[PDB]
Amino acid sequence: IREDLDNYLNEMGEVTADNIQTWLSGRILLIENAAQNIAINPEPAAVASLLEQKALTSTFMASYLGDATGHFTIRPDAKMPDGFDPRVRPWYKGAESSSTSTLTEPYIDAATGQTIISIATAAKKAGQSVGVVGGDLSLQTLINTLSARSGMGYAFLVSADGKILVHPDKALVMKSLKEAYPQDTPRISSDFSEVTVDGKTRIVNFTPIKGLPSVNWYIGLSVDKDK
């Protein structure tokens, strides 16, 4: 009866991880392809034309290029805060310091003011960088992608440092597992974890998401032990 729940949780973990891996992978390729295309010709009119294309605008809230001079182009265009400097933003710093594409942790979007993640990569022509390209995805979008799937629990997204990145309870976003579950804290190091929450015991496991550049993230599954 309990060796069945365990097997079910492990398999649901693998399926959920694989699904979000394949969902992220096509988006990573769109941003990489934009960075490649920008590297062919980084003139601003040419950059603008690339970012305005439907495949990008229909997939991301926005995509943009920032460079080492502080120049910024974003499509769809948006009035940025006074003094905006892309060089000090988390998407930029993460990608500038990496030989591959990157994904950010959730952060506060400068354009909309809402919490987002970004896919970002350095655009390199002949080994020389011409800036960093990024694309934005809303927290709500990630929340929806994780909940498209289990009738007895929910999936969440947690980094390998134990920081909850995406969770249906928005108050737990960007809390550590310990801050979110101070008693009986679920441990990524263990197969299963039991925690009492809002009056019911739950079982939690973690599955690694394969094939994501730069990041080591997990799917968490949390299930009501009784049902």
Side-chain angles (χ1 to χ4, degrees), residues 6-10 12-13 15-42 44-53 55-95 97-124 126-127 129-148 150-151 153-182 184-197 199 201-224 226:
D6 295 1
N7 292 131
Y8 171 76
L9 297 185
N10 289 2
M12 288 321 295
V15 167
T16 305
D18 192 81
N19 173 50
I20 194 171
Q21 171 189 0
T22 63
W23 189 90
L24 277 44
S25 290
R27 293 162 170 81
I28 291 160
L29 274 166
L30 287 169
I31 291 306
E32 294 178 343
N33 200 351
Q36 293 153 16
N37 294 343
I38 288 168
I40 304 172
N41 183 16
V47 169
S49 291
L50 297 162
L51 307 171
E52 280 168 1
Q53 298 312 307
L56 291 174
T57 68
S58 70
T59 300
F60 298 103
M61 298 163 64
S63 70
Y64 43 79
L65 172 75
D67 72 22
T69 79
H71 188 260
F72 190 63
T73 304
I74 180 167
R75 296 290 186 265
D77 210 359
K79 175 82 181 83
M80 304 304 295
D82 293 323
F84 183 75
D85 182 351
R87 296 165 296 188
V88 307
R89 301 297 289 153
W91 57 269
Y92 187 102
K93 296 191 295 195
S97 88
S98 180
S99 55
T100 188
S101 292
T102 64
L103 290 145
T104 74
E105 295 184 347
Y107 70 98
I108 307 169
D109 183 26
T112 62
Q114 66 172 285
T115 300
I116 63 163
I117 72 161
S118 291
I119 294 164
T121 198
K124 287 191 279 185
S129 186
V130 310
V132 174
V133 184
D136 292 344
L137 300 165
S138 74
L139 184 69
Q140 191 58 53
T141 294
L142 300 179
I143 289 171
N144 300 2
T145 309
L146 282 186
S147 68
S150 312
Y154 64 91
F156 62 102
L157 177 83
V158 64
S159 79
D161 309 323
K163 194 190 287 158
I164 300 165
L165 307 183
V166 183
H167 198 287
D169 184 359
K170 297 174 177 295
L172 302 183
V173 168
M174 295 302 272
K175 306 299 179 304
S176 71
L177 287 169
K178 184 172 175 184
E179 292 159 350
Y181 300 116
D184 305 321
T185 300
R187 300 193 201 92
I188 303 184
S189 70
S190 81
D191 277 9
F192 298 90
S193 285
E194 297 214 351
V195 59
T196 53
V197 191
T201 281
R202 310 187 70 90
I203 300 184
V204 177
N205 76 333
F206 305 94
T207 311
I209 306 172
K210 305 147 87 166
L212 299 184
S214 89
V215 292
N216 179 5
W217 294 348
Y218 285 84
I219 295 291
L221 293 178
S222 185
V223 175
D224 197 303
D226 290 350

Short mmCIF file of all heavy atoms in Angstrom, two decimals, residues 146-188, unseen atoms left out:
data_model
loop_
_atom_site.label_atom_id
_atom_site.label_comp_id
_atom_site.label_asym_id
_atom_site.label_seq_id
_atom_site.Cartn_x
_atom_site.Cartn_y
_atom_site.Cartn_z
N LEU A 146 3.17 24.04 -14.42
CA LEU A 146 3.33 23.02 -13.40
C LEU A 146 2.01 22.39 -12.95
O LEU A 146 2.01 21.30 -12.38
CB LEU A 146 4.03 23.57 -12.16
CG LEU A 146 5.54 23.73 -12.25
CD1 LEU A 146 6.05 24.13 -10.89
CD2 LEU A 146 6.24 22.46 -12.69
N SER A 147 0.90 23.08 -13.16
CA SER A 147 -0.40 22.62 -12.68
C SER A 147 -1.29 21.99 -13.76
O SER A 147 -2.35 21.46 -13.44
CB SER A 147 -1.11 23.78 -12.02
OG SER A 147 -1.44 24.74 -12.99
N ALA A 148 -0.85 22.03 -15.02
CA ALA A 148 -1.51 21.32 -16.11
C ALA A 148 -1.68 19.83 -15.80
O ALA A 148 -2.68 19.25 -16.21
CB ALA A 148 -0.73 21.50 -17.40
N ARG A 149 -0.73 19.24 -15.06
CA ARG A 149 -0.80 17.86 -14.54
C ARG A 149 -1.77 17.68 -13.37
O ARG A 149 -3.00 17.84 -13.52
CB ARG A 149 0.59 17.43 -14.04
N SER A 150 -2.05 14.62 -11.53
CA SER A 150 -2.17 14.35 -10.10
C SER A 150 -3.46 14.98 -9.62
O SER A 150 -3.66 16.18 -9.80
CB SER A 150 -0.98 14.95 -9.35
OG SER A 150 0.25 14.62 -9.96
N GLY A 151 -4.35 14.15 -9.06
CA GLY A 151 -5.60 14.62 -8.42
C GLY A 151 -5.52 14.78 -6.90
O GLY A 151 -6.39 15.42 -6.31
N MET A 152 -4.45 14.24 -6.29
CA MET A 152 -4.23 14.21 -4.83
C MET A 152 -3.08 15.08 -4.31
O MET A 152 -2.78 15.05 -3.10
CB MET A 152 -3.92 12.76 -4.43
N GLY A 153 -2.42 15.84 -5.19
CA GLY A 153 -1.37 16.78 -4.78
C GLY A 153 -0.96 17.75 -5.87
O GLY A 153 -1.65 17.87 -6.89
N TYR A 154 0.18 18.41 -5.67
CA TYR A 154 0.67 19.42 -6.63
C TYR A 154 2.18 19.32 -6.80
O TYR A 154 2.87 18.80 -5.94
CB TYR A 154 0.30 20.82 -6.15
CG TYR A 154 0.99 21.17 -4.85
CD1 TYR A 154 2.23 21.81 -4.85
CD2 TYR A 154 0.40 20.85 -3.62
CE1 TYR A 154 2.89 22.09 -3.67
CE2 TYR A 154 1.04 21.16 -2.43
CZ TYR A 154 2.28 21.79 -2.47
OH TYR A 154 2.98 22.09 -1.33
N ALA A 155 2.65 19.82 -7.94
CA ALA A 155 4.07 19.95 -8.24
C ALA A 155 4.54 21.39 -8.00
O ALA A 155 3.83 22.37 -8.23
CB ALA A 155 4.32 19.59 -9.69
N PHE A 156 5.76 21.50 -7.50
CA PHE A 156 6.42 22.79 -7.42
C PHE A 156 7.86 22.67 -7.93
O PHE A 156 8.36 21.57 -8.22
CB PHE A 156 6.32 23.35 -6.01
CG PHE A 156 7.00 22.52 -4.97
CD1 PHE A 156 8.24 22.88 -4.46
CD2 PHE A 156 6.40 21.37 -4.48
CE1 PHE A 156 8.87 22.13 -3.48
CE2 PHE A 156 7.04 20.60 -3.51
CZ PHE A 156 8.27 20.97 -3.00
N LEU A 157 8.50 23.82 -8.12
CA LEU A 157 9.84 23.92 -8.68
C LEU A 157 10.77 24.51 -7.64
O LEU A 157 10.48 25.57 -7.07
CB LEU A 157 9.81 24.80 -9.94
CG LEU A 157 11.18 25.04 -10.61
CD1 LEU A 157 11.52 23.89 -11.50
CD2 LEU A 157 11.14 26.29 -11.48
N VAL A 158 11.87 23.81 -7.39
CA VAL A 158 12.80 24.17 -6.35
C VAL A 158 14.22 24.05 -6.89
O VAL A 158 14.51 23.15 -7.67
CB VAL A 158 12.51 23.36 -5.06
CG1 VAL A 158 12.75 21.88 -5.27
CG2 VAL A 158 13.33 23.86 -3.88
N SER A 159 15.11 24.98 -6.53
CA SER A 159 16.50 24.92 -6.97
C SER A 159 17.21 23.87 -6.15
O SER A 159 16.73 23.45 -5.09
CB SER A 159 17.22 26.26 -6.77
OG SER A 159 17.62 26.44 -5.41
N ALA A 160 18.40 23.52 -6.60
CA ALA A 160 19.21 22.53 -5.88
C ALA A 160 19.80 23.09 -4.58
O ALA A 160 20.39 22.33 -3.83
CB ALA A 160 20.29 21.96 -6.76
N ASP A 161 19.69 24.40 -4.33
CA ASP A 161 20.06 24.96 -3.03
C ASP A 161 18.89 24.89 -2.02
O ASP A 161 19.05 25.28 -0.86
CB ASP A 161 20.45 26.43 -3.15
CG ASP A 161 21.46 26.68 -4.21
OD1 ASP A 161 22.35 25.81 -4.36
OD2 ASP A 161 21.34 27.74 -4.89
N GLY A 162 17.73 24.41 -2.47
CA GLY A 162 16.57 24.29 -1.63
C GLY A 162 15.69 25.53 -1.58
O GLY A 162 14.86 25.68 -0.68
N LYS A 163 15.81 26.40 -2.60
CA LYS A 163 14.97 27.57 -2.73
C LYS A 163 13.78 27.27 -3.61
O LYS A 163 13.89 26.91 -4.79
CB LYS A 163 15.78 28.74 -3.31
CG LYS A 163 15.11 30.11 -3.18
CD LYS A 163 15.84 31.17 -3.98
CE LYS A 163 17.16 31.56 -3.36
NZ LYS A 163 18.08 32.18 -4.36
N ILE A 164 12.60 27.48 -3.08
CA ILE A 164 11.39 27.29 -3.84
C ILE A 164 11.29 28.44 -4.86
O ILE A 164 11.24 29.59 -4.46
CB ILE A 164 10.14 27.29 -2.93
CG1 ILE A 164 10.24 26.16 -1.90
CG2 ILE A 164 8.88 27.19 -3.76
CD1 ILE A 164 9.26 26.29 -0.75
N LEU A 165 11.24 28.09 -6.14
CA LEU A 165 11.18 29.04 -7.25
C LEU A 165 9.77 29.27 -7.73
O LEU A 165 9.35 30.42 -7.97
CB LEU A 165 12.05 28.54 -8.40
CG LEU A 165 13.49 28.19 -7.99
CD1 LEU A 165 14.32 27.78 -9.19
CD2 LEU A 165 14.18 29.34 -7.28
N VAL A 166 9.01 28.20 -7.89
CA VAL A 166 7.66 28.30 -8.40
C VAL A 166 6.77 27.36 -7.60
O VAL A 166 7.10 26.19 -7.43
CB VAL A 166 7.55 27.93 -9.88
CG1 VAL A 166 6.13 28.11 -10.41
CG2 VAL A 166 8.51 28.75 -10.74
N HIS A 167 5.66 27.89 -7.10
CA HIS A 167 4.78 27.18 -6.18
C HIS A 167 3.37 27.74 -6.33
O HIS A 167 3.21 28.93 -6.53
CB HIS A 167 5.30 27.33 -4.75
CG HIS A 167 4.75 26.33 -3.79
ND1 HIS A 167 3.46 26.38 -3.33
CD2 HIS A 167 5.34 25.30 -3.13
CE1 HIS A 167 3.27 25.43 -2.43
NE2 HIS A 167 4.40 24.76 -2.29
N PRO A 168 2.35 26.88 -6.28
CA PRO A 168 0.98 27.39 -6.41
C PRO A 168 0.58 28.37 -5.30
O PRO A 168 -0.22 29.26 -5.52
CB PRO A 168 0.09 26.12 -6.36
CG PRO A 168 0.99 25.06 -5.78
CD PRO A 168 2.39 25.40 -6.20
N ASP A 169 1.13 28.21 -4.11
CA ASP A 169 1.00 29.17 -3.05
C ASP A 169 2.10 30.23 -3.26
O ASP A 169 3.22 30.03 -2.83
CB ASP A 169 1.14 28.47 -1.69
CG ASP A 169 0.93 29.40 -0.51
OD1 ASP A 169 0.69 30.61 -0.74
OD2 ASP A 169 1.03 28.92 0.64
N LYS A 170 1.71 31.38 -3.83
CA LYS A 170 2.62 32.45 -4.21
C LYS A 170 3.42 33.03 -3.05
O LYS A 170 4.50 33.55 -3.24
CB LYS A 170 1.87 33.57 -4.94
CG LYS A 170 1.22 33.18 -6.25
CD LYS A 170 0.38 34.34 -6.78
CE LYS A 170 -0.26 34.08 -8.11
NZ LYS A 170 0.77 33.94 -9.12
N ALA A 171 2.90 32.90 -1.84
CA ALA A 171 3.60 33.32 -0.64
C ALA A 171 4.83 32.51 -0.36
O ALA A 171 5.69 32.97 0.38
CB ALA A 171 2.68 33.27 0.59
N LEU A 172 4.91 31.28 -0.89
CA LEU A 172 6.12 30.46 -0.73
C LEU A 172 7.18 30.66 -1.81
O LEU A 172 8.27 30.12 -1.70
CB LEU A 172 5.74 28.98 -0.63
CG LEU A 172 4.78 28.65 0.51
CD1 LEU A 172 4.54 27.14 0.52
CD2 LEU A 172 5.36 29.14 1.83
N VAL A 173 6.87 31.42 -2.86
CA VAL A 173 7.85 31.69 -3.91
C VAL A 173 9.09 32.37 -3.32
O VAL A 173 8.99 33.30 -2.52
CB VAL A 173 7.22 32.54 -5.00
CG1 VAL A 173 8.26 33.08 -5.97
CG2 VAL A 173 6.22 31.71 -5.76
N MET A 174 10.24 31.88 -3.69
CA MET A 174 11.54 32.38 -3.26
C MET A 174 11.79 32.29 -1.75
O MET A 174 12.64 32.99 -1.21
CB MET A 174 11.77 33.80 -3.81
CG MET A 174 11.87 33.86 -5.32
SD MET A 174 13.20 32.82 -5.93
CE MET A 174 14.60 33.92 -5.87
N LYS A 175 11.07 31.39 -1.09
CA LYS A 175 11.39 30.99 0.28
C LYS A 175 12.22 29.70 0.22
O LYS A 175 12.01 28.87 -0.67
CB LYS A 175 10.09 30.70 1.03
CG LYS A 175 9.04 31.81 1.03
CD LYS A 175 9.52 33.11 1.68
CE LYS A 175 8.44 34.21 1.63
NZ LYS A 175 7.92 34.52 0.24
N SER A 176 13.14 29.53 1.14
CA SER A 176 13.83 28.27 1.32
C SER A 176 12.80 27.21 1.84
O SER A 176 11.71 27.54 2.34
CB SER A 176 15.00 28.39 2.29
OG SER A 176 14.55 28.59 3.64
N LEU A 177 13.13 25.94 1.66
CA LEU A 177 12.30 24.87 2.18
C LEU A 177 12.15 24.98 3.70
O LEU A 177 11.06 24.79 4.23
CB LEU A 177 12.88 23.52 1.80
CG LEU A 177 12.77 23.05 0.34
CD1 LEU A 177 13.66 21.81 0.15
CD2 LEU A 177 11.34 22.73 0.00
N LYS A 178 13.22 25.38 4.37
CA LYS A 178 13.20 25.60 5.83
C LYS A 178 12.32 26.77 6.26
O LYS A 178 11.59 26.63 7.23
CB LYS A 178 14.61 25.81 6.38
CG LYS A 178 14.64 25.93 7.89
CD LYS A 178 16.08 25.93 8.39
CE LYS A 178 16.18 26.19 9.90
NZ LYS A 178 17.60 26.27 10.36
N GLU A 179 12.39 27.92 5.58
CA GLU A 179 11.46 29.03 5.85
C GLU A 179 10.03 28.66 5.54
O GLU A 179 9.12 29.08 6.23
CB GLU A 179 11.79 30.29 5.03
CG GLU A 179 13.08 30.94 5.46
CD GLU A 179 13.68 31.85 4.39
OE1 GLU A 179 13.20 31.86 3.21
OE2 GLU A 179 14.70 32.47 4.74
N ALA A 180 9.81 27.88 4.49
CA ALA A 180 8.45 27.54 4.13
C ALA A 180 7.89 26.41 5.03
O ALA A 180 6.68 26.36 5.26
CB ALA A 180 8.37 27.11 2.68
N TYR A 181 8.75 25.49 5.48
CA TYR A 181 8.31 24.33 6.27
C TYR A 181 9.25 24.21 7.46
O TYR A 181 10.10 23.31 7.51
CB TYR A 181 8.37 23.07 5.43
CG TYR A 181 7.48 23.15 4.23
CD1 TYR A 181 8.00 23.14 2.94
CD2 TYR A 181 6.11 23.31 4.39
CE1 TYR A 181 7.17 23.25 1.84
CE2 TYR A 181 5.27 23.43 3.29
CZ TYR A 181 5.81 23.39 2.02
OH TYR A 181 4.97 23.49 0.92
N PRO A 182 9.08 25.11 8.44
CA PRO A 182 9.97 25.14 9.60
C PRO A 182 10.01 23.86 10.45
O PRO A 182 11.05 23.56 11.03
CB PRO A 182 9.41 26.29 10.46
CG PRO A 182 8.56 27.08 9.54
CD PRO A 182 8.00 26.11 8.54
N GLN A 183 8.89 23.16 10.55
CA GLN A 183 8.87 21.85 11.23
C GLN A 183 8.79 20.72 10.20
O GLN A 183 8.04 20.82 9.23
CB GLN A 183 7.70 21.76 12.21
N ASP A 184 9.57 19.66 10.42
CA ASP A 184 9.67 18.54 9.48
C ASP A 184 9.98 19.08 8.07
O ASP A 184 9.17 18.98 7.14
CB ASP A 184 8.38 17.71 9.44
CG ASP A 184 7.94 17.22 10.80
OD1 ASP A 184 8.78 16.81 11.65
OD2 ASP A 184 6.69 17.25 10.97
N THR A 185 11.14 19.72 7.94
CA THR A 185 11.48 20.33 6.65
C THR A 185 11.81 19.20 5.68
O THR A 185 12.70 18.38 5.96
CB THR A 185 12.65 21.32 6.81
OG1 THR A 185 12.26 22.36 7.73
CG2 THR A 185 13.07 21.94 5.45
N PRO A 186 11.09 19.13 4.55
CA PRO A 186 11.47 18.22 3.46
C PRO A 186 12.93 18.35 3.01
O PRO A 186 13.44 19.48 2.95
CB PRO A 186 10.56 18.65 2.31
CG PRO A 186 9.40 19.30 2.97
CD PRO A 186 9.92 19.95 4.20
N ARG A 187 13.60 17.22 2.78
CA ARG A 187 15.03 17.20 2.49
C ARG A 187 15.20 16.66 1.09
O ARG A 187 14.79 15.55 0.80
CB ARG A 187 15.79 16.27 3.43
CG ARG A 187 15.70 16.61 4.92
CD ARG A 187 16.75 15.82 5.71
NE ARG A 187 16.41 15.72 7.14
CZ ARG A 187 15.72 14.73 7.71
NH1 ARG A 187 15.28 13.68 7.01
NH2 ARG A 187 15.46 14.76 9.02
N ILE A 188 15.91 17.42 0.24
CA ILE A 188 16.22 16.99 -1.10
C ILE A 188 17.11 15.74 -1.07
O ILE A 188 17.09 14.93 -2.00
CB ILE A 188 16.87 18.11 -1.95
CG1 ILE A 188 15.93 19.35 -1.96
CG2 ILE A 188 17.14 17.62 -3.36
CD1 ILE A 188 16.40 20.49 -2.83
#
